[model samples]
Target chain A: GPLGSELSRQIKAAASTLEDIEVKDDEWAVDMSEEAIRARAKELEVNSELTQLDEYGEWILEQAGDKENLPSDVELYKKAAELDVLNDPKIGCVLAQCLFDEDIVNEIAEHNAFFTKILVTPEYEKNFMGGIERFLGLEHKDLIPLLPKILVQLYNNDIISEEEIMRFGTKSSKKFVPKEVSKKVRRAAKPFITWLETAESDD
Target chain B: GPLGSELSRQIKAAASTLEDIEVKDDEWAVDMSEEAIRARAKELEVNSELTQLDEYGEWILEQAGDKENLPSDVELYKKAAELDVLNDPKIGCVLAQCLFDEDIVNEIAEHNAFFTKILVTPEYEKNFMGGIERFLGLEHKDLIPLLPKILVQLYNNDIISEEEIMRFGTKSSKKFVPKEVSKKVRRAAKPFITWLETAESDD
Candidate 1:
């Protein structure tokens, strides 16, 4: 009886208070501001990551650092690969940004250890792709030997869609890969392109 | 027609290439490091702020500093108020944090110009309120004269809810206001609370 009465009393008080304080301004327009926008954006990012990462994932994130200062050890890379850290987009993007050096790329190419890891990871796909694009965009044409295999992995995994690959192919010549490396990349990519074309004709 | 056919041909080639390169279920994963997480967080922060602020808002933000480093001039406050810089949550929070000193609080209480400006401004309501709470949370019982008017403005503008006010009232004694000043805030808030209670009985 005490609890029920208390609830009734509280509800009654709330209704009264709501009416007494209520100012009806149908004309009142909501005002916008940069701070609100920034806060909301920050909130969204925090919430998304909060949902995505578990305690270990979060602890792993807390352990991360900036590009210039990230650890460059191959053994650490192997450890991370074993942990399947690349399966997380935030971690994947970071790894792609900080660890995707010539040695690491060569290592991934040679061992085929973590290729499937990059393929199936979700969320920061665009960021991960952007990281790869940046690495390939630079002066590491010597990494060309690994291109066909990586492309095959990406294609097999549907990491790079047919349209995306074709688009890349169409514009590949415009990319500034050195002529020798470009020829090889094109040659490596040709069969894939041909296969896509045949699939389209059949459709 | 030739252009369309050429486009179709390119598309077909691309589709073929996509299928040719498609690789499946090959074992691979990527590595991670602490630097990567830090880099990604920084990148996201940069990107979010990039999306949030325009050029002018950014320039205004550059001019802002924290409480200690901010300009203390009334004219600067007026200038910020005019530029609508305080409408931004980040800038407003900084400005409120910096500007709600003894002299500025007294000045706004005296002039009443910037009071309405802040009340009606967008975003940072919580931040602005928090700044005020901190200001009052300090040893400035001299600010008691200002509280009632500020409360009225907050109420009129619907900047704060009755629940927030009542919540503040419940905790006002715990706040650092001098006894005399605390009494005045309670007394000032009494009518609003009383009005709500009376309205509840009527309902």
Candidate 2:
């Protein structure tokens, strides 16, 4: 997107191509001046960029939560990377989380440490817990309270092993601790295991 | 300039070409969905057209009002006409008006009556009057009050002859009536005459 100064300059360049016509001087009345009218028109064109920008921003927010509806994170990341642009830490974090959720934990651990950095940030902590809280509803004061029970269920179904969870815990501590302390750290994950167990009684 | 429908459609088409990224998903409560995000990005490309339409509409208004900061009507018309591969009345009106204003009235008149027809329509009347109103401010009402004055100015300054206004006016009458009524219309145009007189006095 063209920034403010660039857009302004573009409008000015485009506006200068106009032919001048004699304006009836009416300073005493509410008459539109050629310059004023054209200026208003130019302002309108520049302001319109705001609307376009907002639409794109909103659209991006919507795409963040659904993997099935979009291309793989690897594909999108590869395309972005191919441009030789600096990797966005925010995007890297989300992509790592997505890969982990997709059962590609080895890939996340091997390829990117930026994800670990981001997941421990205050913003990422809020988002991570917020997602869980919303799914579990009003009772979710601490996310760790539900994690153990979910792990048990995954273990029972063979979706994940107890050893895998322990490995993930170890990996999480190794990459993300000391250097970064999560603002809303998961202090007692066993409580989350119990909460998920209580909730699973309904299912 | 093209009408709202045409401009709106074109802007919509242009907007669809932009890239979009999906950033979040509802199922996971806070994770971004790549597919949904890309879909939103695609939608925004169309939404961008709404802004484009607004900008283009304002540009058309400026073009109509003698602000003339847009590409010349003739140029735009020729481009659209060529691209459309069809005889377009809207483009025809713009092309004819440009030629007529530049004293090529006979050229357009000789080649096609489509140009002549557009010149005398209510659309042309409204368009020309809008430009004139923007130029003359409140001193003139309908175009009838100022056409003869402009015609006379053109005649006296040899921008045009009185006979040419009549000749073009007569040919234009085939598309409209009451042609003779505009002949001496400026004879009694006191408000504008006095306004011009006052301006000249100040000078």
Candidate 3:
């Protein structure tokens, strides 16, 4: 690419990844204004409806099918967020599929922040939690510890803020979640809870 | 009684009633500011801990025990609110006991706003809803329609705001409420829901 084209492409790439980012007036490094970011993001033309991407999802399903290796089921969530399809009810099931797979969760711990970002949105909370609750109802003892592990990873990344984490922790006995499942996952999350309450506040 | 001779004493007598009330300056003849209202409210010290008034509660119980003759069981709630004791969890149970007796509800329809005022506080939501849900689990079919009727009365009195009604309505499928009871109350509440959405909007 020519200098002009190369410069523009990098700007576009930067803008696309900068969801929810705001820029200050004095930062002369780039045109990181909200308007500029929106324009760049809008130009890429993400799929509005989830069905339009089923073929891509089929490929994704296959990637997740390979399982323990990495990033197939993992890619499903990030792409869903990228394309703005995370609000789709089926996307929660997609997230649940990844979460239920222990090896995938271990491999994809770093990427949990993207889903945490999705989870933090007001509208999509139920969809994601419903997904988690659905799998949680299956009573997989193996799956319990992994959720807190993923939560810790997200908290480490600072994407899931303290209030967000505690609110998640607070409503342990949810409407859809089974009593035993709520107790198990919440009990497992005690380390993260205790650290935040004590260690983090110590400074 | 001799106004000319005891003018200072008469003035003191008149001022005592307005003791804690604030007088606003600049375009204010009399103060109706929240500070003034709150100061006035503070002057009236009701018992903080509910236990200080067992004799009063005994009298209340006797009045409620008289039953169906209107405002006896009803007065328990009004007096509790006046005494600022509705924050008591036991007070919610008192409200519930009165609500459970269908004849009392029919008698007390006009005075439902007083309890609505109590319920409108954020802290008491659980106590009120929990009380209702506990009684509802008993499968009293007759007790179902009366709740919506009382809600309608509260709504008519303009004591329960629109969002407040919806908030109360939305939590029917609450964590503690049995599915069957939630369904019955919600189904009976259909007229209010429809009226809220349709009649108010008139679109």
Candidate 4:
């Protein structure tokens, strides 16, 4: 489940080309000049109202994809900065799913020791918990077993703390679950949460 | 205003010792044994119910302080992971103010190229916007001028894009603000936002 979840996100993202062009498909789409993007951008602006969603933003998003049409997670970040769509929910949120990555999560935690401040709160939660929710297919039973070990690796590596694990897994803790978290996930998480509450707490 | 605001947060955070103890003041507070901290944590749990706010959590918060009693931002992050309070909003949020630092934000951008994922969205918005909101005294006129330069530095350096400057300053742009953003800050941020809109848009 763990590996498949990772594979699925990559496969889905890879299978598709990362184009921000909200236009009719055409062969002329490749090698589109800035003029072409700007003209189409005007259409979106008129329909949506001339918001900040501009040609530059769409163009930047397109630049992140490699020749294979795969969106490089790192490039997504870099270009997101150039276009200023990093926080645009409509624009930026897609990257969250496009690059729903556990490897990145582990990388952040591994290097977190160097930063002056760490992503302990929502930063970690968004990256870690959201990654699991979006990337992992919960119905895959093997994922249930793998999750507990994953949590410990995170805990020991300073990704998220033990309390972070319980909050996500436990049914009714203050921060127990994502607001729209899956029931299947909650059920799968039960084994670890129950163990933490009873068995681990005793120790 | 900028310097003072920066000074103020650090001063406030530094002036008081970083103690998580809700106990009465006593000289014996120094060199507190784990046993002592655990006993008092019991009192908090009783009143608050047996929440996860345990001795370890409090103990970890305390350890982040140096001999001079200021909380070290780096240590706070490290310790936060150990106790799993990294996501505990009640506990972790204090660090937001305690280390409301701009230096760290700039550093993250400098090294963003190295990471698999960069903090473009909420990460940049939180650390960047929150720092300006929390640090930097908007009332100071000099800061008003300084802000434009800061935004550019952030933009040119790949922390946030040109669109970021407008969102924060524009009267009404999407993703433009913190929920409780100050009016003073809005006004101060205007010069740059206005410049970005009118001046930069032309050529």
lDDT of 3 by residue, A138-181 (tens): 54566666766666765676644566566556566565577777
- In the range B1-203, model 2's lDDT, one tens digit per residue, is 11123334434443432211111121323434564355556657756744433344444555655333435545444544445422322333233233333222223223233333333444443343333323333223343444545544533444333334444333323232233433333343444445545655798
Give the per-residue lDDT of model 4 (tens digit) for B113-196: 422122335445444554454445432334444565666665666655566456556544223334444556667677667767
User: Which ten contiguous residues of candidate 2 chain B have the minimum total lDDT?
Assistant: B17-26
CA shift of B58, model 2, Å:
24
Candidate 3, B129: how far from true, in Å? 4.8
Q: What is the C-alpha lDDT profile of model 2 across A1-203, one tens digit per residue? A: 22223334434443432211111222313546565565556657755634433333343345645434444445444444554322332332233233333322223233333334334444443333333323222223343344445445434544333443443333233233331322223334445444544565766
Put down candidate 1 lDDT per residue, A74-114, tens digits, no spaces: 54455556655545655544444445455543333342344
Q: Using lDDT, rank the candidates from best to worst.
A: 3, 1, 4, 2
- Model 4 residue A31 lDDT? 34
The numbered model that scores best in TM-score is: 3
What share of the reference contacts survives in each candidate? 0.00, 0.00, 0.00, 0.00
Q: Which tens-of-lDDT digit does each residue in A5-34 have in candidate 4?
A: 323444444333222122223333573666
- Going through the candidates in the order shown, the clash numbers are 26, 35, 0, 1
Q: Which residue runs of candidate 1 sit more than 4 Å off their true CA positions?
A: A1-203, B1-36, B43-74, B81-86, B90-92, B103-105, B121-124, B136-203
Error of 3 at A172 (Å): 52
Model 4 chain A scores worst on lDDT over the 10 consecutive residues at: A15-24
Q: If you assessed candidate 1 against the hidden native complex, which CAPRI class would it receive?
A: incorrect
Alpha-carbon TM-score of each model against the true structure:
0.24, 0.19, 0.30, 0.25
Between prediction 1 and prediction 3, which has the larger TM-score?
Answer: 3
User: Is 2 or 4 the stronger prediction by lDDT?
Assistant: 4
| Clash number for candidate 2 | 35
lDDT of each: 0.49, 0.38, 0.54, 0.46
DockQ of each: 0.02, 0.02, 0.01, 0.01
